[PDB]
PDB file of C-alpha atoms and ligand atoms in Angstrom:
ATOM      1  CA  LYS A 625      -3.420  10.025  11.323  1.00  0.00           C
ATOM      2  CA  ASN A 626      -5.664   7.446   9.542  1.00  0.00           C
ATOM      3  CA  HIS A 627      -4.047   5.325   6.862  1.00  0.00           C
ATOM      4  CA  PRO A 628      -6.540   2.655   5.861  1.00  0.00           C
ATOM      5  CA  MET A 629      -4.821   1.840   2.549  1.00  0.00           C
ATOM      6  CA  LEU A 630      -1.298   1.675   3.983  1.00  0.00           C
ATOM      7  CA  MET A 631      -2.785  -0.274   6.899  1.00  0.00           C
ATOM      8  CA  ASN A 632      -4.548  -2.742   4.572  1.00  0.00           C
ATOM      9  CA  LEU A 633      -1.378  -3.313   2.519  1.00  0.00           C
ATOM     10  CA  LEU A 634       0.603  -3.873   5.722  1.00  0.00           C
ATOM     11  CA  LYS A 635      -1.797  -6.820   6.392  1.00  0.00           C
TER      12      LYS A 635
ATOM     13  CA  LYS B1265      32.394 -15.160   8.369  1.00  0.00           C
ATOM     14  CA  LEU B1266      28.670 -14.579   7.646  1.00  0.00           C
ATOM     15  CA  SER B1267      26.616 -16.274  10.343  1.00  0.00           C
ATOM     16  CA  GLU B1268      23.767 -18.581   9.358  1.00  0.00           C
ATOM     17  CA  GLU B1269      21.315 -15.984  10.654  1.00  0.00           C
ATOM     18  CA  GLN B1270      23.092 -13.370   8.525  1.00  0.00           C
ATOM     19  CA  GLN B1271      22.961 -15.631   5.414  1.00  0.00           C
ATOM     20  CA  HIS B1272      19.270 -16.233   6.159  1.00  0.00           C
ATOM     21  CA  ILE B1273      18.555 -12.475   6.325  1.00  0.00           C
ATOM     22  CA  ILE B1274      20.217 -11.881   2.938  1.00  0.00           C
ATOM     23  CA  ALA B1275      18.383 -14.767   1.231  1.00  0.00           C
ATOM     24  CA  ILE B1276      15.029 -13.430   2.519  1.00  0.00           C
ATOM     25  CA  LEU B1277      15.737  -9.851   1.400  1.00  0.00           C
ATOM     26  CA  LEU B1278      16.942 -11.055  -2.025  1.00  0.00           C
ATOM     27  CA  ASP B1279      13.746 -13.043  -2.447  1.00  0.00           C
ATOM     28  CA  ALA B1280      11.621 -10.185  -1.085  1.00  0.00           C
ATOM     29  CA  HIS B1281      13.127  -7.839  -3.648  1.00  0.00           C
ATOM     30  CA  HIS B1282      12.678 -10.325  -6.559  1.00  0.00           C
ATOM     31  CA  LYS B1283       9.014 -10.702  -5.597  1.00  0.00           C
ATOM     32  CA  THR B1284       8.475  -6.888  -5.589  1.00  0.00           C
ATOM     33  CA  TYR B1285      10.703  -5.624  -8.447  1.00  0.00           C
ATOM     34  CA  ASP B1286       9.897  -6.799 -11.994  1.00  0.00           C
ATOM     35  CA  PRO B1287      12.968  -6.011 -14.096  1.00  0.00           C
ATOM     36  CA  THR B1288      10.757  -6.211 -17.241  1.00  0.00           C
ATOM     37  CA  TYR B1289       8.470  -3.415 -15.970  1.00  0.00           C
ATOM     38  CA  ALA B1290       5.478  -5.241 -17.496  1.00  0.00           C
ATOM     39  CA  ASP B1291       2.939  -3.619 -15.181  1.00  0.00           C
ATOM     40  CA  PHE B1292       3.790  -0.127 -16.520  1.00  0.00           C
ATOM     41  CA  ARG B1293       1.233  -0.698 -19.273  1.00  0.00           C
ATOM     42  CA  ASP B1294      -1.510  -0.392 -16.604  1.00  0.00           C
ATOM     43  CA  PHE B1295      -0.448   3.200 -15.797  1.00  0.00           C
ATOM     44  CA  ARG B1296      -2.095   6.298 -17.275  1.00  0.00           C
ATOM     45  CA  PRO B1297      -0.061   6.963 -20.418  1.00  0.00           C
ATOM     46  CA  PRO B1298       3.044   9.165 -20.329  1.00  0.00           C
ATOM     47  CA  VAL B1299       2.532  12.446 -22.234  1.00  0.00           C
ATOM     48  CA  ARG B1300       5.516  14.363 -23.534  1.00  0.00           C
ATOM     49  CA  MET B1301       4.256  17.224 -25.709  1.00  0.00           C
ATOM     50  CA  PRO B1302       0.673  21.809 -17.783  1.00  0.00           C
ATOM     51  CA  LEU B1303       2.318  18.902 -15.829  1.00  0.00           C
ATOM     52  CA  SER B1304       1.815  16.425 -18.642  1.00  0.00           C
ATOM     53  CA  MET B1305       3.788  13.571 -17.004  1.00  0.00           C
ATOM     54  CA  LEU B1306       2.000  13.883 -13.629  1.00  0.00           C
ATOM     55  CA  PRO B1307      -0.735  11.186 -14.265  1.00  0.00           C
ATOM     56  CA  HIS B1308       1.858   8.651 -15.495  1.00  0.00           C
ATOM     57  CA  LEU B1309       4.470   9.361 -12.818  1.00  0.00           C
ATOM     58  CA  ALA B1310       1.880   9.556 -10.040  1.00  0.00           C
ATOM     59  CA  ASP B1311       0.806   6.045 -11.096  1.00  0.00           C
ATOM     60  CA  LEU B1312       4.410   4.895 -11.190  1.00  0.00           C
ATOM     61  CA  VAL B1313       5.035   6.260  -7.693  1.00  0.00           C
ATOM     62  CA  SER B1314       1.745   4.787  -6.443  1.00  0.00           C
ATOM     63  CA  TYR B1315       2.638   1.355  -7.831  1.00  0.00           C
ATOM     64  CA  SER B1316       6.108   1.693  -6.382  1.00  0.00           C
ATOM     65  CA  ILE B1317       4.800   2.480  -2.904  1.00  0.00           C
ATOM     66  CA  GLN B1318       2.751  -0.754  -3.027  1.00  0.00           C
ATOM     67  CA  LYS B1319       5.906  -2.715  -3.950  1.00  0.00           C
ATOM     68  CA  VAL B1320       8.003  -0.986  -1.296  1.00  0.00           C
ATOM     69  CA  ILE B1321       5.346  -2.031   1.274  1.00  0.00           C
ATOM     70  CA  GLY B1322       5.439  -5.645  -0.005  1.00  0.00           C
ATOM     71  CA  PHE B1323       9.235  -5.598   0.405  1.00  0.00           C
ATOM     72  CA  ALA B1324       9.103  -4.016   3.873  1.00  0.00           C
ATOM     73  CA  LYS B1325       6.701  -6.652   5.289  1.00  0.00           C
ATOM     74  CA  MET B1326       9.294  -9.313   4.499  1.00  0.00           C
ATOM     75  CA  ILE B1327      12.216  -7.573   6.357  1.00  0.00           C
ATOM     76  CA  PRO B1328      13.165  -9.897   9.299  1.00  0.00           C
ATOM     77  CA  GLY B1329      11.862  -8.233  12.464  1.00  0.00           C
ATOM     78  CA  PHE B1330       9.604  -5.681  10.726  1.00  0.00           C
ATOM     79  CA  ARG B1331       6.591  -7.949  11.583  1.00  0.00           C
ATOM     80  CA  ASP B1332       7.366  -7.659  15.326  1.00  0.00           C
ATOM     81  CA  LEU B1333       6.804  -3.896  15.215  1.00  0.00           C
ATOM     82  CA  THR B1334       3.413  -2.360  16.008  1.00  0.00           C
ATOM     83  CA  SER B1335       1.216  -1.384  13.118  1.00  0.00           C
ATOM     84  CA  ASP B1336       1.611   2.269  14.197  1.00  0.00           C
ATOM     85  CA  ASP B1337       5.405   2.151  13.897  1.00  0.00           C
ATOM     86  CA  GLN B1338       5.156   0.110  10.667  1.00  0.00           C
ATOM     87  CA  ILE B1339       3.043   2.984   9.338  1.00  0.00           C
ATOM     88  CA  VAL B1340       5.405   5.763  10.526  1.00  0.00           C
ATOM     89  CA  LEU B1341       8.416   3.934   9.009  1.00  0.00           C
ATOM     90  CA  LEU B1342       6.796   3.357   5.602  1.00  0.00           C
ATOM     91  CA  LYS B1343       5.353   6.855   5.352  1.00  0.00           C
ATOM     92  CA  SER B1344       8.721   8.501   6.027  1.00  0.00           C
ATOM     93  CA  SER B1345      10.882   6.131   3.923  1.00  0.00           C
ATOM     94  CA  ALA B1346       8.618   5.450   0.937  1.00  0.00           C
ATOM     95  CA  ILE B1347      10.116   8.153  -1.348  1.00  0.00           C
ATOM     96  CA  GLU B1348      13.689   7.252  -0.240  1.00  0.00           C
ATOM     97  CA  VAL B1349      13.196   3.551  -1.046  1.00  0.00           C
ATOM     98  CA  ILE B1350      11.654   4.526  -4.425  1.00  0.00           C
ATOM     99  CA  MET B1351      14.793   6.594  -5.024  1.00  0.00           C
ATOM    100  CA  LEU B1352      17.004   3.656  -3.973  1.00  0.00           C
ATOM    101  CA  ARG B1353      15.142   0.952  -5.874  1.00  0.00           C
ATOM    102  CA  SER B1354      14.998   3.158  -9.016  1.00  0.00           C
ATOM    103  CA  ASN B1355      18.794   2.914  -9.216  1.00  0.00           C
ATOM    104  CA  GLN B1356      18.275  -0.502 -10.883  1.00  0.00           C
ATOM    105  CA  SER B1357      16.647   1.130 -13.924  1.00  0.00           C
ATOM    106  CA  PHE B1358      18.800   4.255 -13.803  1.00  0.00           C
ATOM    107  CA  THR B1359      21.518   4.521 -16.490  1.00  0.00           C
ATOM    108  CA  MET B1360      24.521   6.812 -16.645  1.00  0.00           C
ATOM    109  CA  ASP B1361      24.546   6.394 -20.459  1.00  0.00           C
ATOM    110  CA  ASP B1362      22.080   9.284 -20.676  1.00  0.00           C
ATOM    111  CA  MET B1363      21.201  10.039 -17.017  1.00  0.00           C
ATOM    112  CA  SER B1364      17.775   8.462 -17.288  1.00  0.00           C
ATOM    113  CA  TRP B1365      15.582   5.791 -15.766  1.00  0.00           C
ATOM    114  CA  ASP B1366      15.263   3.257 -18.570  1.00  0.00           C
ATOM    115  CA  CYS B1367      12.276   0.929 -17.985  1.00  0.00           C
ATOM    116  CA  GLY B1368      12.506  -1.106 -21.183  1.00  0.00           C
ATOM    117  CA  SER B1369      11.072   1.166 -23.871  1.00  0.00           C
ATOM    118  CA  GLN B1370      11.209   4.795 -24.986  1.00  0.00           C
ATOM    119  CA  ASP B1371       7.701   5.372 -23.557  1.00  0.00           C
ATOM    120  CA  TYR B1372       8.976   4.185 -20.165  1.00  0.00           C
ATOM    121  CA  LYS B1373      12.285   6.011 -20.237  1.00  0.00           C
ATOM    122  CA  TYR B1374      12.311   8.954 -17.831  1.00  0.00           C
ATOM    123  CA  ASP B1375      14.726  11.855 -17.917  1.00  0.00           C
ATOM    124  CA  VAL B1376      15.125  15.143 -16.156  1.00  0.00           C
ATOM    125  CA  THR B1377      12.465  16.823 -18.329  1.00  0.00           C
ATOM    126  CA  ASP B1378       9.834  14.103 -17.638  1.00  0.00           C
ATOM    127  CA  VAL B1379      10.261  14.543 -13.874  1.00  0.00           C
ATOM    128  CA  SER B1380       9.925  18.284 -14.258  1.00  0.00           C
ATOM    129  CA  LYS B1381       6.745  17.595 -16.255  1.00  0.00           C
ATOM    130  CA  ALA B1382       5.392  16.040 -13.020  1.00  0.00           C
ATOM    131  CA  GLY B1383       5.678  19.339 -11.130  1.00  0.00           C
ATOM    132  CA  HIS B1384       9.225  19.191  -9.786  1.00  0.00           C
ATOM    133  CA  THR B1385      12.169  21.567 -10.131  1.00  0.00           C
ATOM    134  CA  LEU B1386      15.945  21.213 -10.422  1.00  0.00           C
ATOM    135  CA  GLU B1387      16.201  21.953  -6.671  1.00  0.00           C
ATOM    136  CA  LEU B1388      15.103  18.290  -6.307  1.00  0.00           C
ATOM    137  CA  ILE B1389      16.044  16.849  -9.681  1.00  0.00           C
ATOM    138  CA  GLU B1390      19.724  17.889  -9.822  1.00  0.00           C
ATOM    139  CA  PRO B1391      20.658  16.375  -6.424  1.00  0.00           C
ATOM    140  CA  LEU B1392      18.426  13.384  -7.331  1.00  0.00           C
ATOM    141  CA  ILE B1393      20.436  12.688 -10.482  1.00  0.00           C
ATOM    142  CA  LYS B1394      23.675  13.242  -8.589  1.00  0.00           C
ATOM    143  CA  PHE B1395      22.433  10.756  -5.976  1.00  0.00           C
ATOM    144  CA  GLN B1396      21.652   8.216  -8.697  1.00  0.00           C
ATOM    145  CA  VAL B1397      25.115   8.603 -10.238  1.00  0.00           C
ATOM    146  CA  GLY B1398      27.008   8.268  -6.949  1.00  0.00           C
ATOM    147  CA  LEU B1399      24.863   5.285  -6.063  1.00  0.00           C
ATOM    148  CA  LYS B1400      25.450   3.626  -9.477  1.00  0.00           C
ATOM    149  CA  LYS B1401      29.175   4.206  -9.016  1.00  0.00           C
ATOM    150  CA  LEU B1402      29.207   2.107  -5.875  1.00  0.00           C
ATOM    151  CA  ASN B1403      28.480  -0.929  -8.103  1.00  0.00           C
ATOM    152  CA  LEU B1404      26.539  -2.529  -5.273  1.00  0.00           C
ATOM    153  CA  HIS B1405      26.026  -6.260  -5.146  1.00  0.00           C
ATOM    154  CA  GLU B1406      22.313  -7.043  -5.183  1.00  0.00           C
ATOM    155  CA  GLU B1407      22.792  -8.277  -1.568  1.00  0.00           C
ATOM    156  CA  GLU B1408      24.057  -4.827  -0.545  1.00  0.00           C
ATOM    157  CA  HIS B1409      21.261  -3.094  -2.503  1.00  0.00           C
ATOM    158  CA  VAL B1410      18.496  -4.986  -0.691  1.00  0.00           C
ATOM    159  CA  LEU B1411      20.178  -4.601   2.702  1.00  0.00           C
ATOM    160  CA  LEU B1412      20.429  -0.825   2.041  1.00  0.00           C
ATOM    161  CA  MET B1413      16.697  -0.522   1.274  1.00  0.00           C
ATOM    162  CA  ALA B1414      15.835  -2.534   4.407  1.00  0.00           C
ATOM    163  CA  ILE B1415      18.130  -0.441   6.634  1.00  0.00           C
ATOM    164  CA  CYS B1416      16.556   2.703   5.150  1.00  0.00           C
ATOM    165  CA  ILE B1417      13.064   1.500   6.044  1.00  0.00           C
ATOM    166  CA  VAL B1418      13.930   0.472   9.692  1.00  0.00           C
ATOM    167  CA  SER B1419      15.325   3.818  10.785  1.00  0.00           C
ATOM    168  CA  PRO B1420      14.785   4.575  14.502  1.00  0.00           C
ATOM    169  CA  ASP B1421      15.091   8.334  14.180  1.00  0.00           C
ATOM    170  CA  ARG B1422      12.024   8.870  11.943  1.00  0.00           C
ATOM    171  CA  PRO B1423       9.642  11.393  13.616  1.00  0.00           C
ATOM    172  CA  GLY B1424       6.751   9.724  15.458  1.00  0.00           C
ATOM    173  CA  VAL B1425       8.476   6.415  16.062  1.00  0.00           C
ATOM    174  CA  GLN B1426       7.318   5.044  19.428  1.00  0.00           C
ATOM    175  CA  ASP B1427       9.384   1.911  20.091  1.00  0.00           C
ATOM    176  CA  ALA B1428      12.707   3.269  18.816  1.00  0.00           C
ATOM    177  CA  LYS B1429      14.861   0.846  20.797  1.00  0.00           C
ATOM    178  CA  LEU B1430      13.144  -1.969  18.928  1.00  0.00           C
ATOM    179  CA  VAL B1431      13.476  -0.273  15.519  1.00  0.00           C
ATOM    180  CA  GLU B1432      17.193   0.372  16.275  1.00  0.00           C
ATOM    181  CA  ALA B1433      17.623  -3.289  17.281  1.00  0.00           C
ATOM    182  CA  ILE B1434      16.060  -4.551  14.043  1.00  0.00           C
ATOM    183  CA  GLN B1435      18.189  -2.095  12.027  1.00  0.00           C
ATOM    184  CA  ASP B1436      21.395  -3.073  13.877  1.00  0.00           C
ATOM    185  CA  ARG B1437      20.959  -6.689  12.858  1.00  0.00           C
ATOM    186  CA  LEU B1438      20.657  -5.531   9.217  1.00  0.00           C
ATOM    187  CA  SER B1439      23.562  -3.074   9.559  1.00  0.00           C
ATOM    188  CA  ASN B1440      25.814  -5.767  11.035  1.00  0.00           C
ATOM    189  CA  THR B1441      24.824  -8.172   8.272  1.00  0.00           C
ATOM    190  CA  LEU B1442      25.781  -5.551   5.687  1.00  0.00           C
ATOM    191  CA  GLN B1443      29.154  -4.767   7.346  1.00  0.00           C
ATOM    192  CA  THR B1444      29.978  -8.467   7.624  1.00  0.00           C
ATOM    193  CA  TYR B1445      28.837  -9.092   4.026  1.00  0.00           C
ATOM    194  CA  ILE B1446      31.121  -6.324   2.735  1.00  0.00           C
ATOM    195  CA  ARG B1447      34.092  -7.706   4.768  1.00  0.00           C
ATOM    196  CA  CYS B1448      33.539 -11.370   3.692  1.00  0.00           C
ATOM    197  CA  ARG B1449      32.089 -11.187   0.187  1.00  0.00           C
ATOM    198  CA  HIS B1450      33.015  -7.863  -1.378  1.00  0.00           C
ATOM    199  CA  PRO B1451      36.573  -7.943  -2.786  1.00  0.00           C
ATOM    200  CA  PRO B1452      38.886  -4.920  -2.485  1.00  0.00           C
ATOM    201  CA  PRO B1453      39.246  -2.459  -4.048  1.00  0.00           C
ATOM    202  CA  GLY B1454      35.425  -2.221  -4.555  1.00  0.00           C
ATOM    203  CA  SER B1455      34.895  -2.670  -0.853  1.00  0.00           C
ATOM    204  CA  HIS B1456      36.979   0.432   0.034  1.00  0.00           C
ATOM    205  CA  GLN B1457      35.011   2.502   2.567  1.00  0.00           C
ATOM    206  CA  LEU B1458      31.895   0.891   1.105  1.00  0.00           C
ATOM    207  CA  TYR B1459      29.749   0.817   4.286  1.00  0.00           C
ATOM    208  CA  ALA B1460      30.517   4.449   5.119  1.00  0.00           C
ATOM    209  CA  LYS B1461      29.638   5.410   1.514  1.00  0.00           C
ATOM    210  CA  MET B1462      26.344   3.460   1.732  1.00  0.00           C
ATOM    211  CA  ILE B1463      25.477   5.175   5.005  1.00  0.00           C
ATOM    212  CA  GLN B1464      26.259   8.562   3.443  1.00  0.00           C
ATOM    213  CA  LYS B1465      23.669   7.701   0.751  1.00  0.00           C
ATOM    214  CA  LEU B1466      21.110   7.323   3.571  1.00  0.00           C
ATOM    215  CA  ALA B1467      22.036  10.878   4.669  1.00  0.00           C
ATOM    216  CA  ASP B1468      21.699  12.166   1.103  1.00  0.00           C
ATOM    217  CA  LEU B1469      18.245  10.560   1.054  1.00  0.00           C
ATOM    218  CA  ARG B1470      17.084  12.656   4.041  1.00  0.00           C
ATOM    219  CA  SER B1471      17.753  15.877   2.063  1.00  0.00           C
ATOM    220  CA  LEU B1472      16.076  14.471  -0.994  1.00  0.00           C
ATOM    221  CA  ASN B1473      13.095  13.370   1.135  1.00  0.00           C
ATOM    222  CA  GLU B1474      12.780  16.898   2.639  1.00  0.00           C
ATOM    223  CA  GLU B1475      12.948  18.617  -0.750  1.00  0.00           C
ATOM    224  CA  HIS B1476      10.498  16.169  -2.288  1.00  0.00           C
ATOM    225  CA  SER B1477       8.082  16.740   0.615  1.00  0.00           C
ATOM    226  CA  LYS B1478       8.399  20.552   0.103  1.00  0.00           C
ATOM    227  CA  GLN B1479       7.697  20.364  -3.636  1.00  0.00           C
ATOM    228  CA  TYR B1480       4.974  17.738  -3.185  1.00  0.00           C
ATOM    229  CA  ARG B1481       3.210  19.961  -0.617  1.00  0.00           C
ATOM    230  CA  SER B1482       3.307  22.862  -3.139  1.00  0.00           C
ATOM    231  CA  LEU B1483       2.210  20.620  -6.048  1.00  0.00           C
ATOM    232  CA  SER B1484      -0.656  18.949  -4.113  1.00  0.00           C
ATOM    233  CA  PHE B1485      -1.971  22.220  -2.682  1.00  0.00           C
ATOM    234  CA  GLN B1486      -3.470  22.976  -6.090  1.00  0.00           C
ATOM    235  CA  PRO B1487      -6.691  20.880  -6.243  1.00  0.00           C
ATOM    236  CA  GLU B1488      -6.280  20.445 -10.016  1.00  0.00           C
ATOM    237  CA  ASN B1489      -2.921  18.667  -9.521  1.00  0.00           C
ATOM    238  CA  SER B1490      -4.039  16.714  -6.517  1.00  0.00           C
ATOM    239  CA  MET B1491      -6.883  15.485  -8.762  1.00  0.00           C
ATOM    240  CA  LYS B1492      -4.210  13.776 -10.892  1.00  0.00           C
ATOM    241  CA  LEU B1493      -2.686  11.871  -7.964  1.00  0.00           C
ATOM    242  CA  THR B1494      -3.818   8.513  -6.597  1.00  0.00           C
ATOM    243  CA  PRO B1495      -5.590   7.818  -3.299  1.00  0.00           C
ATOM    244  CA  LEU B1496      -2.531   5.888  -2.052  1.00  0.00           C
ATOM    245  CA  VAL B1497      -0.098   8.723  -2.923  1.00  0.00           C
ATOM    246  CA  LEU B1498      -2.430  11.182  -1.159  1.00  0.00           C
ATOM    247  CA  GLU B1499      -2.554   8.989   1.948  1.00  0.00           C
ATOM    248  CA  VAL B1500       1.217   8.304   2.069  1.00  0.00           C
ATOM    249  CA  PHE B1501       2.595  11.724   1.030  1.00  0.00           C
ATOM    250  CA  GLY B1502      -0.170  14.058   2.204  1.00  0.00           C
ATOM    251  CA  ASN B1503      -3.552  15.737   1.624  1.00  0.00           C
TER     252      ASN B1503
HETATM  253  C1  VDZ C1483       9.937   0.413 -10.488  1.00  0.00           C
HETATM  254  C2  VDZ C1483      10.780   1.425 -10.519  1.00  0.00           C
HETATM  255  C3  VDZ C1483      10.969   2.265  -9.323  1.00  0.00           C
HETATM  256  O1  VDZ C1483      10.136   1.984  -8.169  1.00  0.00           O
HETATM  257  C4  VDZ C1483      10.718   3.712  -9.835  1.00  0.00           C
HETATM  258  C5  VDZ C1483      11.380   4.143 -11.168  1.00  0.00           C
HETATM  259  C6  VDZ C1483      12.027   5.356 -11.493  1.00  0.00           C
HETATM  260  C7  VDZ C1483      12.169   6.480 -10.518  1.00  0.00           C
HETATM  261  C8  VDZ C1483      12.088   7.754 -10.837  1.00  0.00           C
HETATM  262  C9  VDZ C1483      11.751   8.210 -12.230  1.00  0.00           C
HETATM  263  C10 VDZ C1483      10.440   9.029 -12.139  1.00  0.00           C
HETATM  264  C11 VDZ C1483      10.378  10.110 -11.031  1.00  0.00           C
HETATM  265  C12 VDZ C1483      10.841   9.560  -9.671  1.00  0.00           C
HETATM  266  C13 VDZ C1483       9.696   8.516  -9.211  1.00  0.00           C
HETATM  267  C14 VDZ C1483      11.139  10.474  -8.476  1.00  0.00           C
HETATM  268  C15 VDZ C1483      10.016  11.089  -7.656  1.00  0.00           C
HETATM  269  C16 VDZ C1483      10.730  12.082  -6.708  1.00  0.00           C
HETATM  270  C17 VDZ C1483       8.836  11.701  -8.454  1.00  0.00           C
HETATM  271  C18 VDZ C1483       7.771  12.268  -7.522  1.00  0.00           C
HETATM  272  C19 VDZ C1483       6.433  12.597  -8.183  1.00  0.00           C
HETATM  273  C20 VDZ C1483       5.320  13.021  -7.174  1.00  0.00           C
HETATM  274  C21 VDZ C1483       4.286  13.724  -8.005  1.00  0.00           C
HETATM  275  C22 VDZ C1483       4.723  11.890  -6.288  1.00  0.00           C
HETATM  276  O2  VDZ C1483       5.853  13.955  -6.282  1.00  0.00           O
HETATM  277  C23 VDZ C1483      12.098   9.692  -7.506  1.00  0.00           C
HETATM  278  C24 VDZ C1483      12.670   8.477  -8.304  1.00  0.00           C
HETATM  279  C25 VDZ C1483      12.224   8.767  -9.718  1.00  0.00           C
HETATM  280  C26 VDZ C1483      11.396   3.154 -12.287  1.00  0.00           C
HETATM  281  C27 VDZ C1483      11.452   1.724 -11.833  1.00  0.00           C
HETATM  282  O3  VDZ C1483      12.871   1.502 -11.396  1.00  0.00           O
END
């Protein structure tokens, strides 16, 4: 995986 | 009729949608300009999709129960539904007058040829337009529209979902709200088989998602096209 941007936007 | 919890859920989703969908499309001016003379519309439409993913995420975080999910499942749900919710939410700008997405000005009016100028074929675009028409024809109340997007996002059968019983439980509460809303607030004849027709749209979206993923994979494989994408689109859709 790894989804730092999606993760960041998800809070 | 509609329970207080059900009325609550609708009010939150309405507000969530209003906070994430600007019906004046004012932010479109920040996008790389549309070019209609290659893949000339790829920079502009990549920016539009990228922006739209951000807004879909902002909507999703407000869905009652979505917050109780793990970040991993939040991620799997958003990654798999993002294009489907963009397809759903785009129905608000879509017009059957000329089969186009009309975002306020001729520069920001997108037709079949514009989408093909982003690297896509009729294999996607024809069923996409047909989706948009059949969706339009439902004449959804805004309440049904926002419930449909939320149900689409909290789908327990997405690959990689871990706590599916929980995702199903959150979805069921939304599904039951929608069914009750149709029964109590949507007058016949409009309400005729309306829930079943909304659920069929969710099925249509799976096929559209699969075809988009196929074409996107082909598009993004070329490093010169993937150059034109955004970091968020690359992270959400691949490569
Ligand atoms: C704010 C919005 C929606 O989020 C998005 C809008 C329109 C939707 C469109 C028109 C352009 C092309 C789109 C984004 C389609 C998309 C499959 C294009 C994919 C492009 C790429 C390169 C990421 O694969 C689906 C819905 C289509 C306009 C406005 O209603």
